[PDB]
Structure formats: structure tokens, C-alpha cells
């Protein structure tokens, strides 16, 4: 139930709260109120490469031609 | 400057546009027109009103199997948490739909019976 | 080039890629003010331009 | 020209007469010093890495080769570091 | 109802503005070439000749 930077409940699919705005060791749902341990969800990592059209230049045109 | 626009027609050939706008904050906005003035609704108020949803089913219906697409996941982070931030209430279908009927009660000329 | 950037837990999610793109298009390496490009065309009517 | 008298002209230009002593190779290597170079024009790609659970952003910005952008725009390696240090951040 | 799919990686089959289902781009052209062969050949009792089958390839 951990996809990207957001987490869901395992029983109703509700979007859980941010695990650093809640008091420690417990993350509680708002519909099932299923309390999840804040300890080791994961390490919430998301990598985002830029759009590859974001930086047009004279030098980017030499990449796909050559 | 981005947006989408459908022109739905009824079976008696009567039209009604529904425009979704994209805000730079990351949330989207439903738009319509009942009389000659416009109205702006956030669409998760309308996604939770149409049927009995989960909140991963809003995620699983926009995202396909491309969970690794970090563009789509991050812009949908702002859309679902922005509805929880602005509306700590409105938690199931019969409660979102009473809020949506309470604001538009005087403009849809509803009865005192409804 | 790689630099860490830290925030607290009170702050909700920033995009931080549309931020970096819109700052990388504004930060100038070598700019003469109010001049964007300098072109050497073919010499029209004798004189060098 | 006539109707608006715009100081915010749509396409301003300026014509620069070359001296006859300097040659055409000393001119097109001179226009690179005048033409602007953006930090956008040197970057191949940027990869952020947001880790939380303290919001930690690892901004890794990947350039072109030093044998590639110091020939097109003649931007040196040490000048690129100060734009990141004193202009970008 | 049983699909779990979205995005341009698939192609969405719509009839008059509602989603009927989801199918791949490669099969979505085959079943757009098949439905034209079956509406012109008038043996199929469900496909009218007046139907518009707009397939947008990826
Ligand atoms: Zn729950």
C-alpha cells in the first residue's frame, strides 16, 4: 500500500496522512481507523527526471542528429 | 492555459458543457453553467459523489500500471491531499453529496421538500 | 553537480521539478543586459554587418 | 512606429559595423561573447530525489561534456560553478 | 468493470461517449479494421453502415 510518496490503507484504500505530521509510532486511518505502525513503512523515495523538452538549446539539437 | 472540454448531449438533443481546468497548484477544477453564470467545483468532490469510491480507486483509475511515472504520481498527490486539506469532512458518498446539494439548492430552484 | 536541500515536516509537497526548470531558464551564465543574441549575416551591399 | 510609438518594440535590433582590420573569424568568435548563455543551455537532465521519513531533496543536475559546452558556448568549468553557487541557488 | 488500466499506453474503446473497455494499440487497430470490414459487408446484424469508427493510432 506504498506507491510513490503516498500511502493507502490496506482495508479501505483511503489515503493515509503524511507520516511526519502525525504523532510517533502510529498512523491512523480516517475511515477504518486502522492504526498502522509509523516505524518502517519504507523510506519514501521518488526520483523525477526532467521532461527532456524542458531545456531547449543549440547543443541539445546536436544530440539526436549525431 | 491547459484544460479539457466535453459537450455532452441529452437524448432530447440538449447540450451541456463540462470543462476541467488545470491549476498550477496541482489541483483541477470542474466547471459548468446552469444559468448564464459559471460555477467552479473541485473534481474530487464530484468523483466522490458519483459512486461509492475508495481513495486508491481514484489513484488506480487515473494511473494505469505506470506507477513509476513520477510526473503523474506527484500531480495526483496534490489533488487527493488538497481535498483532504480543504475538506476534513466529506468522507463518504452520502456526505459529499449533501454539501454539493446545499450550495446549489437556491440556484437549482429546489423545493423545501427536497 | 549535486546539492542536498532540506525542509521540515510542516511543509506539504512542492513539485520541485517545475521549480528547478523555471529557475534554470532564468539563471544566466554570461549575459550582456538587454541583448539576447548576436548574429553575423552575409555582407549586404558591401559593408560588414 | 507611427501609431503606438512603442518603447517596448516587438523585435529590437542593433547593427554593428565591423572594422576592416579584423577578419570574419574574429567576428563569429566575438558574437559568442555577446550572445547570452542560459543555465538551461548547458544541462542535459536534472534528477531530483525526494526522501521523507525532514524533507530531503537531492538535486542532481547532469550537464553536457566539458568538451561539448565549452566549445559551443565557450563556458568554462569554473564559471559554471559560480553560477550555481552565486546565481542559481 | 474488470480492466485496471488507463493512460495512452493502452487504447480506450468508446461508443458514443462511454467506456466499453480497454485493449492494446496493436489489437485495437485489428478490431478497427475488422469492424469496417463487417459494417460494409452487411451480414453482421449489429453494425450499421452509418457508424463512424474513428481509430486514433498511437
Ligand atoms: Zn482504513
UniProtKB/Swiss-Prot annotation, chain A:
Q: Taxonomically, which superkingdom?
A: Eukaryota
Which regions span the lipid bilayer? none
Q: Where in the cell does this protein reside? A: Nucleus, Nucleolus
Report residue spans for region: Interaction with RPA2: 1-59
* Zinc finger boundaries on the chain: C4-type: 9-32
Tell me a GO biological process for this protein: nucleolar large rRNA transcription by RNA polymerase I
Q: Which GO terms describe its molecular function?
A: DNA-directed RNA polymerase activity; nucleic acid binding; RNA polymerase II-specific DNA-binding transcription factor binding; zinc ion binding
Q: Which residues bind Zn(2+) 1?
A: 9, 12, 29, 32
Keywords assigned by UniProt, alphabetized: DNA-directed RNA polymerase, Metal-binding, Nucleus, Ribosome biogenesis, Transcription, Zinc, Zinc-finger
UniProt-annotated stretches for the region Necessary and sufficient for recruitment into Pol I: 1-66
Keyword Magnesium appears in the UniProt entry? no
Q: Which GO terms describe its cellular component?
A: nucleus; RNA polymerase I complex
Q: What more is known? A: Present with 8450 molecules/cell in log phase SD medium.
- Per the similarity annotation, which family is this? Belongs to the archaeal RpoM/eukaryotic RPA12/RPB9/RPC11 RNA polymerase family.
Described function: DNA-dependent RNA polymerases catalyze the transcription of DNA into RNA using the four ribonucleoside triphosphates as substrates. Component of RNA polymerase I (Pol I) which synthesizes ribosomal RNA precursors. Besides, RNA polymerase I has intrinsic RNA cleavage activity. Proposed to contribute to the polymerase catalytic activity and form the polymerase active center together with the two largest subunits. Subunit RPA12 contributes a catalytic zinc ribbon that is required for RNA cleavage by Pol I. Involved in transcriptional termination.
| Assembly and oligomerization | Component of the RNA polymerase I (Pol I) complex consisting of 14 subunits: RPA135, RPA190, RPC40, RPA14, RPB5, RPO26, RPA43, RPB8, RPA12, RPB10, RPC19, RPC10, RPA49 and RPA34. The complex is composed of a horseshoe-shaped core containing ten subunits (RPA135, RPA190, RPB5, RPO26, RPB8, RPB10, RPC10, RPA12, RPC19 and RPC40) where RPA135 and RPA190 form the DNA-binding cleft. Outside of the core, RPA14 and RPA43 form the stalk that mediates interactions with transcription initiation factors and newly synthesized RNA. Interacts with RPA2/RPA135.
Included stretch of the parent chain = 2 to 67 of 125
Swiss-Prot record, chain B:
Query: Where is this protein localized, as stated in its record?
Result: Nucleus, Nucleolus
| SS bonds (residue pairs) | none
The highest taxon in the source lineage is: Eukaryota
Miscellaneous information on this protein: Three distinct zinc-containing RNA polymerases are found in eukaryotic nuclei: polymerase I for the ribosomal RNA precursor, polymerase II for the mRNA precursor, and polymerase III for 5S and tRNA genes.
Instruction: Name the job this protein performs.
Output: DNA-dependent RNA polymerases catalyze the transcription of DNA into RNA using the four ribonucleoside triphosphates as substrates. Component of RNA polymerase I (Pol I) which synthesizes ribosomal RNA precursors. Besides, RNA polymerase I has intrinsic RNA cleavage activity. RPA190 and RPA135 both contribute to the polymerase catalytic activity and together form the Pol I active center. In addition, subunit RPA12 contributes a catalytic zinc ribbon that is required for RNA cleavage by Pol I.
Instruction: Return the similarity comment.
Output: Belongs to the RNA polymerase beta chain family.
What binding partners and quaternary form does the record give? Component of the RNA polymerase I (Pol I) complex consisting of 14 subunits: RPA135, RPA190, RPC40, RPA14, RPB5, RPO26, RPA43, RPB8, RPA12, RPB10, RPC19, RPC10, RPA49 and RPA34. The complex is composed of a horseshoe-shaped core containing ten subunits (RPA135, RPA190, RPB5, RPO26, RPB8, RPB10, RPC10, RPA12, RPC19 and RPC40) where RPA135 and RPA190 form the DNA-binding cleft. Outside of the core, RPA14 and RPA43 form the stalk that mediates interactions with transcription initiation factors and newly synthesized RNA.
Q: What is this protein called?
A: DNA-directed RNA polymerase I subunit RPA135
* Organism per entry: Saccharomyces cerevisiae (strain ATCC 204508 / S288c)
Identify the coding gene. RPA135
Section covered of the full-length record: 231 to 344 of 1203
Curated annotation (Swiss-Prot), chain C:
- Signal peptide, first to last residue: none
Origin: domain of life? Eukaryota
What compartments host this protein?
A: Nucleus, Nucleolus
Function summary: DNA-dependent RNA polymerases catalyze the transcription of DNA into RNA using the four ribonucleoside triphosphates as substrates. Component of RNA polymerase I (Pol I) which synthesizes ribosomal RNA precursors. Besides, RNA polymerase I has intrinsic RNA cleavage activity. RPA190 and RPA135 both contribute to the polymerase catalytic activity and together form the Pol I active center. In addition, subunit RPA12 contributes a catalytic zinc ribbon that is required for RNA cleavage by Pol I.
Question: How does this chain assemble?
Answer: Component of the RNA polymerase I (Pol I) complex consisting of 14 subunits: RPA135, RPA190, RPC40, RPA14, RPB5, RPO26, RPA43, RPB8, RPA12, RPB10, RPC19, RPC10, RPA49 and RPA34. The complex is composed of a horseshoe-shaped core containing ten subunits (RPA135, RPA190, RPB5, RPO26, RPB8, RPB10, RPC10, RPA12, RPC19 and RPC40) where RPA135 and RPA190 form the DNA-binding cleft. Outside of the core, RPA14 and RPA43 form the stalk that mediates interactions with transcription initiation factors and newly synthesized RNA.
Q: Which family does it belong to?
A: Belongs to the RNA polymerase beta' chain family.
- Additional note from the record: Present with 2840 molecules/cell in log phase SD medium.
Protein name listed in UniProt: DNA-directed RNA polymerase I subunit RPA190
Q: Which gene encodes it?
A: RPA190
Amino acid at each position: 500500500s506504498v506507491v510513490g510518496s503516498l500511502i493507502f490503507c490496506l482495508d479501505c484504500g483511503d489515503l493515509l496522512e503524511n507520516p511526519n505530521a502525525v504523532l510517533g509510532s502510529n498512523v491512523e486511518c480516517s475511515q477504518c481507523k486502522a492504526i498502522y505502525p509509523k516505524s518502517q513503512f519504507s523510506n519514501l523515495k521518488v526520483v523525477t527526471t526532467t521532461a527532456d523538452d524542458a531545456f531547449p538549446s543549440s547543443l541539445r539539437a546536436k544530440k539526436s542528429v549525431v | 492555459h491547459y484544460g479539457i472540454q466535453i459537450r455532452s448531449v441529452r437524448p432530447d438533443q440538449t447540450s451541456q458543457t463540462n470543462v476541467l481546468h488545470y491549476l498550477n497548484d496541482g489541483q483541477v477544477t470542474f466547471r459548468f453553467s446552469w444559468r448564464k453564470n459559471e460555477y467552479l467545483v473541485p473534481v474530487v468532490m464530484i468523483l466522490k459523489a458519483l459512486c461509492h469510491t475508495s481513495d486508491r480507486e481514484i489513484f488506480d483509475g487515473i494511473i494505469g500500471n505506470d506507477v513509476k511515472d513520477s510526473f503523474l504520481t506527484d500531480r495526483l498527490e496534490l489533488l487527493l491531499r488538497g481535498f483532504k486539506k480543504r475538506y476534513p469532512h466529506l468522507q463518504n458518498r452520502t456526505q459529499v453529496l449533501q454539501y454539493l446539494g446545499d450550495k446549489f439548492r437556491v440556484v437549482f430552484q429546489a423545493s423545501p421538500d427536497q | 553537480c549535486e546539492f542536498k536541500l532540506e525542509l521540515a515536516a510542516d511543509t506539504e509537497k512542492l513539485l520541485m521539478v517545475n521549480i528547478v526548470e523555471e529557475i534554470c531558464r532564468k539563471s544566466i551564465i554570461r549575459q550582456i543586459p538587454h541583448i539576447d543574441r548576436c548574429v553575423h549575416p552575409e555582407p549586404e551591399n558591401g559593408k560588414r554587418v | 512606429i507611427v501609431m503606438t510609438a512603442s518603447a517596448a518594440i516587438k523585435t529590437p535590433q542593433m547593427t554593428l559595423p565591423i572594422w576592416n582590420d579584423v577578419s570574419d573569424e574574429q567576428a563569429d568568435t566575438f558574437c559568442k561573447s555577446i550572445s547570452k548563455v542560459l543555465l538551461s543551455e548547458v544541462i542535459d537532465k536534472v534528477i531530483v530525489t525526494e526522501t521523507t521519513g525532514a524533507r530531503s531533496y537531492v538535486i542532481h543536475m547532469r550537464f553536457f561534456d566539458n568538451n561539448e559546452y565549452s566549445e559551443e558556448y565557450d563556458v568554462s568549468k569554473e564559471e559554471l560553478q559560480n553560477v550555481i553557487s552565486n546565481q542559481f541557488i | 468493470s474488470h480492466t485496471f488500466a488507463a493512460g495512452p499506453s493502452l487504447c480506450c474503446v468508446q461508443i458514443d461517449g462511454k467506456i466499453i473497455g480497454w485493449v492494446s494499440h496493436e489489437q485495437g487497430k485489428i478490431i478497427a479494421d475488422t469492424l469496417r470490414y463487417w459494417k460494409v459487408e452487411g451480414k453482421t446484424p449489429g453494425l450499421p453502415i452509418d457508424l463512424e469508427i474513428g481509430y486514433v493510432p498511437p
